[PDB]
């Protein structure tokens, strides 16, 4: 048997994996990493918006701080999140940013002077003073007042990766790559690590450590159409389910983004829109200010996806031949304007589309984008399954709730590795395990004979066919308007497609380097993840953040202010095991009210969220007046933990 | 063997734990030489080539080099020192440009198979520099060594002599083509390898170079035909069994 | 029809004694916005899904699928088939990269190895406070510091150096480059000494051809050619 | 490029999964070049000494290789042809041979010193061969070009005439010491390398080879300084301006 | 900490520590041997008298 041990075992090479790996390798925990391909290609590699953090130093971002980041964080979640968990975020961010800082990441920085800006309330020019200038800089991103997207010209995600990789080869960490996981190790409910593949040599290999940190990404590949890169397919997640322990939360909290290329789905940032981009129909009709007057192409993301979807049903939508599509138009902004702000977004359109997005106009369509949903977590990043830890875009640690905000998921990645990753590091430092070769031979002879079983299928059904039907009914059935009449369709066909997946046969034979192999175990672990999307979006009766119920269009806070959690507790069972988590208002610093985008008193109002509310006005005036800072106030309202080392306060320009 | 050059051989570095400098005086001797080599066929072509324009020029032209105003008719064994100066630089150069050939089966294979699938120009032109370079070690040392040991036979009768009754002619034709591209494109790449003017935009400058390039080449190679053509004719034209020609020049001014 | 495109793959198994070097053809239909990616996907769920490949972002930016696409070093999933007026497109594995399989190398270990080798992380004596402003950096530093910074370790310019296929200790192209990206970095205090001690020798920058195919497929257009020889002239002068 | 080539050069194996065998070809090549430019010296050594036995014995013998006995006087161009092969062969040998050069700094750094601490005989040796290789490369061009290309001035007289009045003895001098150091050398290399006659006592077989290998070389660098010699004198004393000794043995039967 | 585990671990490298790890290698256990010197330099080199078998 092939047993390999270190103290801090990561799984995911992403943002969130690294800045974990540094963690614990810098306070002397020997660690591993874990990934499918190298480190820097992961998808945190394609962010491209930028990273939200409260710096407060350009003119935009003047004022800024970490109560206004909170509350666009937790109105922006459509009050799904742990607000906790949201405060330790906003708190922590701008740490985030400077450290990375530190580290090479070469942040846009601000200079003296007058700009050309664009603020379509006002495409005003902006004046950047001078004791401003060399500090980093912020962009209009997010739909948030205050501008605090920070980032690295058009590349912020790649560089963020970049620093954080090389860090982990500085700390010695060891990276090893085209290794996957795909089954954990468990005994009495404790974590002691995972049995992991070897893609190239196909050796079954058990990593046992005292910790073990699950930080693979999203699971948009269950969608036909996504932004995502074809390795997200939430078998991370899969994995974590399978334990029949640990438990996934909002997994039918889905997000997706308006104008993705299509078909390819190639990311076409949210700057098109925000500079001026135009959006047409199959007439060439703008039709936004049709839907909304006010706000027009610029409303929320959330309400143009919704818009663009309902357009299309009108009738108004392209006919081509991989669906419909709509149209974005961005060449009425200039040729002069594009060849220098919107560089890149030329060189995509022209690469995968053939067009010149200055002469011609690009295909779009709503697709998957982001993950809300992941393993559930504590404040501190573990499992209900005790030394399992998650962090980063495939967990719940709840700061997005049912809606994630624009630029705080990469934030999320580098901060939660932070935070999680100091957690993590006590974790495996004082915990003590005992490891039985009995149950480490168990669990590897177990996927050895599993491998060896799918080798040997005579079972007649195709992986690819019932892969590809998967991410139709996901895409047709768990998109941006969801009826439980089509949901309860989708439940059934993708239970059905998951049995016929158990009879898959693969042409090639051998266990290495098999492609074939692998969609064999992993599509199978894709659909358990489908079904606890489609079947939890089919159990939540209400309308919340990215979850749109047309038969039930009204945020339910009286029935629904909770978390959905599902689970496997029997590997024989073929439908999730859901439950919920109540989100208790009284835990609130703020309480659930309207969320600033869409339709109006569009909420079944919950009783104590107003009791709650007075609570706030009244504890928060009598200190306001007594003479207290926003710290004490916040402290009386909510009080959150924090890791020592992240305890202090964020200095700002203007202290 | 010195104990510095002991250690160094044992331990990797030098006395001080630092890596040796020679790497890089070597990189920059192969450079310079190269670059002199290059810069002194530019003129070679042109002074070797004034047969274009008449005897008494070509005669003027040689005489100088002896030092004419200076000694009586000139002291010849001055071309033997300057050839020989010329012929030393030319054997360093080689050494070190010699460390960059393919050097093993595998080496070669692997880089022919690669420029034919590349098809890349810059990749292409070093396969020629690398050849031709390899022919000058045979067509470049039989030159040199005549002009150092036979200055006083340089004129238009005598070099034409050599050309043709003595047979240069195949030798120097084949020679004209290689050391021009050779020279030309070392050149070429001697200045994008240190980036003299690379400036704000290299890209355009690096595409200037090209063409220019090209430009000298073909320039010295008709050029150098010509003036070819010349030394063939005249020597063509030797036919009187009782004039020496090969010393004919010399004999005019000792 | 789009017309039909003939797909010649190199394909090659050196776990398995029985496999030997060898091509296979495919006929695949030409499509609208068809890219090498879509192609090879094809292939693999409808032809012969023995054929390995690596991909990943699909979209330019992570530099997975870099491989020989008629000759030239390049990234598959922004190669369009649309361009080759022949529909006779031949798919080889990245030169100069120990092979997994087919058209799989691994360049992420040869990275890695490359970037510890240069110490490829800012170098500073004095640890800068997280809690506190951030030093302040001349826009125009960032700027260049991030045009170099976009290195995406695709190993296109690695595989296109004639040079690192003969000598494979050559550090290449990106490995020079990511040194002038630390160079010219405020925040590394290494000196040119200190540099000279990584690159200074002939596995380093003296074992550069000046061949500049390495400029001439980098997908990101990173100014190697000029770059590369500003780092010879600053290494040539130490001491 | 051929597919096969393509294949070899990606997978490291020919298309059958075996290793190459140009290896063992190359091999091969460069000892059998080797040899026959060894050969090639040990007689050319005695037919060029034949001026110690008088003018007449040379003239003959520099008369049958241009084939007396068929033509005429015999034509020249025979040893034209003669010359080009044997040139061509040192231009493969050398190529072959070329491989073996140690080939950057660190190579060069590490024999040197390694050489001298090892005062070991035979690695010394191999250095020798080494540098007389790198030397002949352009000394022995030299002499193979002329030759090739003026076959009808070889003889007592003409041959004199070269060796003096055209300053080839410092050449000649230098390229004696040289090719004879390399090619006994390279023999007795060539025979312990495949151990033609190691017999049942190798370790005596070897110690004879190496006896045998410095005698054949004190003979031959005595006989070629007598030689030497011979031409140097006579040379010096074709002092008549009126006598065209360059061509005068070709100037006898045509 | 630094852990390596094997199914049989071997200390010594001299005959009888090799042939021990012959025996357990062969039936499919992972198995490491340690040793202060390279193995075929152990004190089993020096014998000289010979091997007692029966034959
Ligand atoms: C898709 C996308 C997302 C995105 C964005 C643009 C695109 C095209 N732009 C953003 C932006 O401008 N601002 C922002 O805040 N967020 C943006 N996002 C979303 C964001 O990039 C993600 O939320 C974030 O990158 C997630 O980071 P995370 O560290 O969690 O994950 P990752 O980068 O995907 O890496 C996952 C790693 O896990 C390994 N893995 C996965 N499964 C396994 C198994 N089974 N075994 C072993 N390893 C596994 C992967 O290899 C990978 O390295
Ligand atoms: C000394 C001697 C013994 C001997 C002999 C001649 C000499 C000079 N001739 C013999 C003969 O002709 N016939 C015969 O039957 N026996 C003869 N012997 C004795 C015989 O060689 C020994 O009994 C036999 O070789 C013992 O074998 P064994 O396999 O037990 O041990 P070894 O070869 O000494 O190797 C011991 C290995 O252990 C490693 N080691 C030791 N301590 C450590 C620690 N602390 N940690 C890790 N490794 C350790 C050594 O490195 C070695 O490899
Ligand atoms: C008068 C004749 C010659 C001229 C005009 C000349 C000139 C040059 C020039 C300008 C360079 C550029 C060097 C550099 O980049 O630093 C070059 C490169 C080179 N030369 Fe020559 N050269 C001559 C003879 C030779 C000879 C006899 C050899 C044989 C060994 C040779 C082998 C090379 C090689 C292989 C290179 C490439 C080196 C590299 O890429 O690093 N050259 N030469
Ligand atoms: C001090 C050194 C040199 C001297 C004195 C010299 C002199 C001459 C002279 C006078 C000729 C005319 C024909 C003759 O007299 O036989 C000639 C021709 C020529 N030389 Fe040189 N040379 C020198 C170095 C070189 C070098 C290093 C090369 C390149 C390897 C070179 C290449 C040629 C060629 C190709 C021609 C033919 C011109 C034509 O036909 O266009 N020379 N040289
Ligand atoms: C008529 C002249 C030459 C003679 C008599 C000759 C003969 C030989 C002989 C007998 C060998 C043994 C080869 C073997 O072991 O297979 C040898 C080795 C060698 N020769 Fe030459 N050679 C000649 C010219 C050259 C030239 C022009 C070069 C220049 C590249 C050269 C470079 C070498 C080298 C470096 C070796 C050692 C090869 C090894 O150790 O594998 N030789 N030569
Ligand atoms: C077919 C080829 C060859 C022919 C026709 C030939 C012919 C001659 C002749 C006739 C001489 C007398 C002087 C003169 O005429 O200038 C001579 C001398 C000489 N040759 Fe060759 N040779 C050939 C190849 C070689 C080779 C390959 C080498 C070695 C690189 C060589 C080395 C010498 C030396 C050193 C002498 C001087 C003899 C002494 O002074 O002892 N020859 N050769
Ligand atoms: C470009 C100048 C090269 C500089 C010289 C030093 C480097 C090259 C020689 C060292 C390696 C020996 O090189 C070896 O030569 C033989 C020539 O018979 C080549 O042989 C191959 O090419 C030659 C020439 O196109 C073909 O006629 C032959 O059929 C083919 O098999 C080997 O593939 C090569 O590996
Ligand atoms: C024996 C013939 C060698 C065949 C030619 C090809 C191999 C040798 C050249 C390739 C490597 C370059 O070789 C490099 O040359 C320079 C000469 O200035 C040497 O320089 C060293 O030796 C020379 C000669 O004794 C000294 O004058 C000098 O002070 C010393 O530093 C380097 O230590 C060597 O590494
Ligand atoms: C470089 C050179 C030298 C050194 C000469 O002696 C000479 C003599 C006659 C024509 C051209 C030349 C010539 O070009
Ligand atoms: C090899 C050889 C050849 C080919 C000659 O033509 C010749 C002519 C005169 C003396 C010696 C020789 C001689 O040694
Ligand atoms: S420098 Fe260019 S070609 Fe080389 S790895 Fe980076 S992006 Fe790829
Ligand atoms: S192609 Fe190679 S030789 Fe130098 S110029 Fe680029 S790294
Ligand atoms: S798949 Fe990422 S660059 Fe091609
Ligand atoms: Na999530």
């Given at each position: 048997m092939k047993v390999q041990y270190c103290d801090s075992l990561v799984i995911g090479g992403g943002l969130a994996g690294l800045r974990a790996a540094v963690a614990t390798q810098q306070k002397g925990l020997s660690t591993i990493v874990l990934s499918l391909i190298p480190v820097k290609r992961?998808?945190?590699?394609?962010?491209?918006?930028?990273?939200?953090?409260?710096?407060?130093?350009?003119?935009?971002?003047?004022?800024?701080?970490?109560?206004?980041?909170?509350?666009?964080?937790?109105?922006?979640?459509?009050?799904?999140?742990?607000?906790?968990?949201?405060?330790?975020?906003?708190?922590?961010?701008?740490?985030?940013?400077?450290?990375?800082?530190?580290?090479?990441?070469?942040?846009?920085?601000?200079?003296?002077?007058?700009?050309?800006?664009?603020?379509?309330?006002?495409?005003?020019?902006?004046?950047?003073?001078?004791?401003?200038?060399?500090?980093?800089?912020?962009?209009?991103?997010?739909?948030?007042?205050?501008?605090?997207?920070?980032?690295?010209?058009?590349?912020?995600?790649?560089?963020?990766?970049?620093?954080?990789?090389?860090?982990?080869?500085?700390?010695?960490?060891?990276?090893?790559?085209?290794?996957?996981?795909?089954?954990?190790?468990?005994?009495?409910?404790?974590?002691?690590?995972?049995?992991?593949?070897?893609?190239?040599?196909?050796?079954?290999?058990?990593?046992?450590?005292?910790?073990?940190?699950?930080?693979?990404?999203?699971?948009?590949?269950?969608?036909?159409?996504?932004?995502?890169?074809?390795?997200?397919?939430?078998?991370?997640?899969?994995?974590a389910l399978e334990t029949g322990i640990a438990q996934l939360g909002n997994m039918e909290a889905v997000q997706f983004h308006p104008t993705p290329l299509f078909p390819s789905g190639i990311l076409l940032t949210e700057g098109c829109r925000g500079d001026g981009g135009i959006l047409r129909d199959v007439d060439g009709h703008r039709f936004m200010p049709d839907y909304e007057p006010e706000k027009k192409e610029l409303a929320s993301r959330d309400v143009v996806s919704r818009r663009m979807i309902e357009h299309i049903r009108k009738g108004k939508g392209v006919q081509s031949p991989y669906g419909q599509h709509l149209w974005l138009d961005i060449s009425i902004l200039g040729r002069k304007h594009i060849e220098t702000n919107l560089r890149d977004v030329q060189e995509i359109c022209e690469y995968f589309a053939g067009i010149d997005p200055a002469e011609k106009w690009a295909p779009v369509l709503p697709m998957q984008h982001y993950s809300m949903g992941g393993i559930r977590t504590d404040y501190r990043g573990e499992?209900?399954?005790?030394?399992?830890?998650?962090?980063?875009?495939?967990?719940?640690?709840?700061?997005?709730?049912?809606?994630?905000?624009?630029?705080?998921?990469?934030?999320?990645?580098?901060?939660?590795?932070?935070?999680?990753?100091?957690?993590?590091?006590?974790?495996?430092?004082?915990?003590?395990?005992?490891?039985?070769?009995?149950?480490?031979?168990?669990?590897?002879?177990?996927?050895?004979?599993?491998?060896?079983?799918?080798?040997?299928?005579?079972?007649?059904?195709?992986?690819?066919?019932?892969?590809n039907r998967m991410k139709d009914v996901m895409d047709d059935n768990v998109g941006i308007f969801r009826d439980g009449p089509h949901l309860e369709k989708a439940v059934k066909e993708l239970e059905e497609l998951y049995k016929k997946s158990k009879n898959v046969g693969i042409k090639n034979k051998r266990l290495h380097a098999n492609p074939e192999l692998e969609e064999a175990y992993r599509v199978p672990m894709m659909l358990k993840v489908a079904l606890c999307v489609a079947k939890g979006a089919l159990d939540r009766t209400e309308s919340r953040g990215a979850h749109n119920r047309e038969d039930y269009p009204k945020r339910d806070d009286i029935n629904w202010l909770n978390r959905t959690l599902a689970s496997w507790p029997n590997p024989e069972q073929t439908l999730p095991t859901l439950e919920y988590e109540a989100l208790d208002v009284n835990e609130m610093e703020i309480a659930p009210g309207y969320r600033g985008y869409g339709a109006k008193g569009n909420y079944i109002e919950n009783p104590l969220s107003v009791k709650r509310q007075e609570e706030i006005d009244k504890i928060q005036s009598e200190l306001e007046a007594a003479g207290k800072d926003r710290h004490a106030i916040q402290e009386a309202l909510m009080p959150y933990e924090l890791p020592a080392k992240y305890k202090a306060r964020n200095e700002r320009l203007g202290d | 063997?010195?104990?510095?050059?002991?250690?160094?051989?044992?331990?990797?570095?030098?006395?001080?734990?630092?890596?040796?400098?020679?790497?890089?005086?070597?990189?920059?001797?192969?450079?310079?030489?190269?670059?002199?080599?290059?810069?002194?066929?530019?003129?070679?072509?042109?002074?070797?080539?004034?047969?274009?324009?008449?005897?008494?020029?070509?005669?003027?032209?040689?005489?100088?080099?002896?030092?004419?105003?200076?000694?009586?008719?000139?002291?010849?064994?001055?071309?033997?020192?300057?050839?020989?100066?010329?012929?030393?630089?030319?054997?360093?150069?080689?050494?070190?440009?010699?460390?960059?050939?393919?050097?093993?089966?595998?080496?070669?294979?692997?880089?022919?198979?690669?420029?034919?699938?590349?098809?890349?120009?810059?990749?292409?032109?070093?396969?020629?520099?690398?050849?031709?370079?390899?022919?000058?070690?045979?067509?470049?040392?039989?030159?040199?060594?005549?002009?150092?040991?036979?200055?006083?036979?340089?004129?238009?009768?005598?070099?034409?002599?050599?050309?043709?009754?003595?047979?240069?002619?195949?030798?120097?034709?084949?020679?004209?083509?290689?050391?021009?591209?050779?020279?030309?494109?070392?050149?070429?790449?001697?200045?994008?390898?240190?980036?003299?003017?690379?400036?704000?935009?290299?890209?355009?400058?690096?595409?200037?170079?090209?063409?220019?390039?090209?430009?000298?080449?073909?320039?010295?190679?008709?050029?150098?035909?010509?003036?070819?053509?010349?030394?063939?004719?005249?020597?063509?034209?030797?036919t009187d069994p009782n004039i020496d020609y090969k010393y004919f020049d010399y004999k005019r001014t000792h | 029809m789009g017309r039909m495109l003939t797909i010649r793959v190199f394909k090659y198994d050196p776990?398995?004694?029985?496999?030997?070097?060898?091509?296979?053809?495919?006929?695949?239909?030409?499509?609208?916005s068809m890219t090498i990616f879509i192609v090879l996907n094809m292939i693999r769920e409808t032809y012969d899904p023995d054929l390995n490949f690596d991909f990943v972002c699909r979209a330019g930016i992570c530099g997975s699928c870099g491989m020989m696409i008629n000759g030239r070093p390049s990234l598959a999933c922004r190669t369009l088939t649309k361009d080759f007026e022949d529909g006779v497109i031949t798919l080889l594995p990245l030169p100069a990269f120990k092979l997994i399989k087919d058209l799989s190398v691994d360049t992420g270990n040869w990275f890695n190895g490359m970037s510890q080798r240069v110490e490829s992380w800012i170098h500073a004596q004095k640890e800068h406070d997280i809690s506190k402003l951030e030093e302040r950096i001349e826009p125009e530093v960032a700027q260049e510091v991030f045009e170099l910074d976009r290195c995406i370790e695709c190993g296109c310019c690695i595989a296109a150096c004639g040079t690192k296929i003969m000598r494979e200790d050559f550090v290449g192209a990106a490995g020079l480059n990511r040194v002038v990206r630390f160079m010219i970095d405020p925040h590394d205090e290494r000196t040119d000494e200190d540099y000279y001690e990584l690159i200074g020798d002939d596995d380093g920058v003296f074992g550069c051809m000046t061949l500049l195919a390495c400029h001439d497929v980098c997908p990101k257009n990173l100014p190697l050619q000029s770059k590369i020889a500003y780092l010879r002239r600053k290494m040539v002068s130490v001491n």
């Open positions: 992961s998808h945190s590699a394609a962010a491209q918006g930028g990273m939200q953090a409260s710096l407060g130093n350009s003119k935009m971002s003047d004022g800024d701080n970490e109560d206004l980041h909170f509350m666009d964080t937790v109105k922006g979640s459509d009050w799904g999140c742990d607000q906790k968990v949201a405060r330790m975020f906003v708190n922590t961010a701008p740490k985030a940013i400077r450290e990375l800082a530190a580290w090479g990441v070469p942040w846009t920085r601000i200079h003296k002077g007058d700009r050309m800006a664009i603020i379509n309330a006002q495409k005003t020019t902006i004046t950047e003073e001078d004791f401003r200038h060399g500090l980093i800089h912020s962009r209009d991103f997010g739909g948030t007042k205050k501008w605090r997207t920070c980032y690295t010209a058009d590349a912020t995600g790649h560089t963020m990766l970049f620093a954080v990789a090389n860090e982990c080869l500085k700390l010695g960490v060891s990276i090893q790559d085209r290794k996957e996981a795909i089954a954990l190790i468990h005994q009495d409910g404790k974590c002691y690590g995972a049995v992991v593949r070897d893609l190239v040599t196909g050796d079954i290999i058990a990593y046992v450590a005292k910790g073990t940190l699950i930080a693979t990404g999203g699971y948009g590949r269950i969608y036909k159409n996504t932004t995502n890169a074809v390795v997200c397919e939430g078998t991370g997640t899969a994995i499992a209900k399954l005790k030394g399992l830890f998650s962090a980063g875009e495939a967990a719940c640690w709840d700061m997005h709730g049912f809606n994630r905000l624009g630029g705080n998921s990469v934030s999320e990645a580098v901060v939660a590795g932070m935070i999680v990753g100091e957690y993590f590091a006590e974790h495996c430092a004082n915990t003590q395990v005992d490891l039985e070769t009995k149950t480490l031979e168990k669990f590897v002879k177990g996927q050895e004979a599993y491998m060896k079983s799918l080798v040997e299928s005579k079972g007649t059904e195709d992986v690819f066919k019932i892969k | 063997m010195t104990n510095e050059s002991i250690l160094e051989s044992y331990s990797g570095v030098t006395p001080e734990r630092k890596k040796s400098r020679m790497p890089a005086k070597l990189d920059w001797w192969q450079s310079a030489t190269g670059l002199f080599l290059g810069l002194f066929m530019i003129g070679h072509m042109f002074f070797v080539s004034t047969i274009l324009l008449g005897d008494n020029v070509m005669l003027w032209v040689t005489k100088k080099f002896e030092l004419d105003f200076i000694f009586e008719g000139g002291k010849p064994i001055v071309v033997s020192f300057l050839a020989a100066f010329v012929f030393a630089v030319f054997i360093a150069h080689a050494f070190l440009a010699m460390r960059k050939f393919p050097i093993n089966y595998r080496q070669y294979l692997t880089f022919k198979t690669h420029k034919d699938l590349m098809r890349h120009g810059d990749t292409t032109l070093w396969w020629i520099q690398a050849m031709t370079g390899f022919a000058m070690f045979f067509l470049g040392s039989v030159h040199l060594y005549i002009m150092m040991t036979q200055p006083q036979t340089i004129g238009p009768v005598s070099s034409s002599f050599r050309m043709v009754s003595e047979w240069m002619w195949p030798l120097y034709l084949v020679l004209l083509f290689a050391v021009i591209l050779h020279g030309s494109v070392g050149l070429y790449r001697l200045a994008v390898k240190w980036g003299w003017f690379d400036g704000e935009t290299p890209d355009k400058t690096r595409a200037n170079l090209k063409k220019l390039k090209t430009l000298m080449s073909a320039f010295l190679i008709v050029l150098g035909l010509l003036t070819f053509g010349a030394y063939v004719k005249k020597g063509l034209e030797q | 776990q398995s004694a029985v496999s030997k070097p060898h091509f296979q053809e495919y006929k695949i239909e030409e499509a609208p």
